[PDB]
Amino acid sequence: PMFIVNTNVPRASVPDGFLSELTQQLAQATGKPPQYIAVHVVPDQLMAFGGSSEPCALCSLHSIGKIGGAQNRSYSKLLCGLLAERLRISPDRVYINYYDMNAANVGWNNSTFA
Amino acid sequence: PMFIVNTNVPRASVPDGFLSELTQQLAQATGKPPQYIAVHVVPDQLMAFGGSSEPCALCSLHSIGKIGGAQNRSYSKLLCGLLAERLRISPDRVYINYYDMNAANVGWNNSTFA
Amino acid sequence: PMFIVNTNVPRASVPDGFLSELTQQLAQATGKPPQYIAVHVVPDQLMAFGGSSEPCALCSLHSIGKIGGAQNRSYSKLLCGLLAERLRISPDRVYINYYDMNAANVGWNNSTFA
Ligand SMILES: *[C@H](c1ccc(C(F)(F)F)cc1)c1cc2c(cc1O)OCO2
Ligand SMILES: *[C@H](c1ccc(C(F)(F)F)cc1)c1cc2c(cc1O)OCO2
Ligand SMILES: *[C@H](c1ccc(C(F)(F)F)cc1)c1cc2c(cc1O)OCO2
């Protein structure tokens, strides 16, 4: 899994350890080892949600499997909770795109997975 | 719907009103209330298009429905028009990825739209 | 095709000529004329891979066809090779997402490629 957050929240408002927490919590939620988890946070973005420039976030979770109806609800509760608690972004100003990747379409270490 | 623009145009060349203009125009084009629309503009990017560093844009439009052959051809006119006028980008230096999202794969407000 | 690299490597470590090298190498690898190729490099990112902030990269390759099992392996060797040689990023700290795009979902110059 790979999780990306883009947000208009400033860099100074991202708390120390945020990437570590995302890594740890995503490992728990996906059942994948922490070593596999990639996390990417992009603050200070020029963005709007519903025509308002109040704090918001646009995110993606790519995973080889572990994506589906109930699972995605659970990820959204977890991730919106974190963005609310840590970045002070209201859950209703977050979008998260979920992508179930075929292993053959993920490159790593000079090759691809299967 | 969610619209993202990555461009090598500098930040000071992005008009202050561009996010709101995109929001309004996309609401009309998709038939969704403006409140649903998220927009994200990423200037000052290191990019090349056809081996040239002249102004260009790499974009995406994600939507739960309202994506298809004819609709996409129409969106491209709308979006190239906006980018040409407001960012001075030639329309043949714009790519737009269109993604039709399943509601189950869009997280929002601690859940998903499924 | 469009290739995007997001990396925590600093801007100054990205060699002059990198975008041109990517354009040329992707033209060769995909068989598509260089005029069609878009490349985008995003340094100085806040990211972690396996909980570690050592150099890493999260990448994507979108293409209308020329995507598949064996081809993706070849692209990964090529692109990890370039990231290792030019940006000093170890291949096992790189993910690359491959997307086979429908021509109807690629917008360019007021239309799509369908
Ligand atoms: C994590 C993972 C990282 C990146 C992607 C990508 F497609 F976005 F590139 C997808 C998944 C991951 C890593 C693995 C793995 C499963 C997952 O989910 O099995 C071996 O390494
Ligand atoms: C807009 C919309 C925003 C984001 C995405 C995402 F998947 F990329 F995250 C997709 C669509 C939208 C919001 C809605 C809605 C439909 C759309 O298209 O119905 C209720 O809220
Ligand atoms: C390259 C190409 C660029 C961008 C995308 C996008 F979908 F991500 F936007 C996809 C492919 C390309 C350009 C062409 C072409 C094929 C490809 O692969 O035929 C005409 O121009």
Structure, described:
Chains A, B, C: The active site is at 1 (proton acceptor). Chains A, B, C: Homotrimer. Interacts with CXCR2 extracellular domain. Interacts with the CD74 extracellular domain, USO1, COPS5 and BNIPL. Chains A, B, C: One of its GO terms (cellular component) is cell surface. Three copies of one chain form a homotrimer. With 114 residues, chain A is of the alpha/beta class. Chain A contains two helices and seven strands; from the N terminus they run E-H-E-E-E-H-E-E-E. The first copy, chain A, has a single domain, classed as Macrophage Migration Inhibitory Factor (2-Layer Sandwich), CATH 3.30.429. The first copy, chain A, has helices spanning 18-30, 69-87, and strands spanning 2-7, 38-42, 46-49, 57-63, 94-100, 106-108, 111-112. Chain A has a four-stranded mixed sheet with strand order 2-1-4-5, covered by helices on one side. In chain A, strand 1 (2-7), helix 1 and strand 2 form a beta-alpha-beta unit. In chain A, helix 1 runs antiparallel to helix 2. Chains in contact: A-B, A-C, B-C. Chains B and C meet through strand 3, strand 4, helix 2 and strand 5 of B and helix 1, strand 2, strand 6 and strand 7 of C. Strand 5 of chain B pairs antiparallel with strand 6 (106-108) of chain C. The complex binds ligand 6H1 (3 copies).
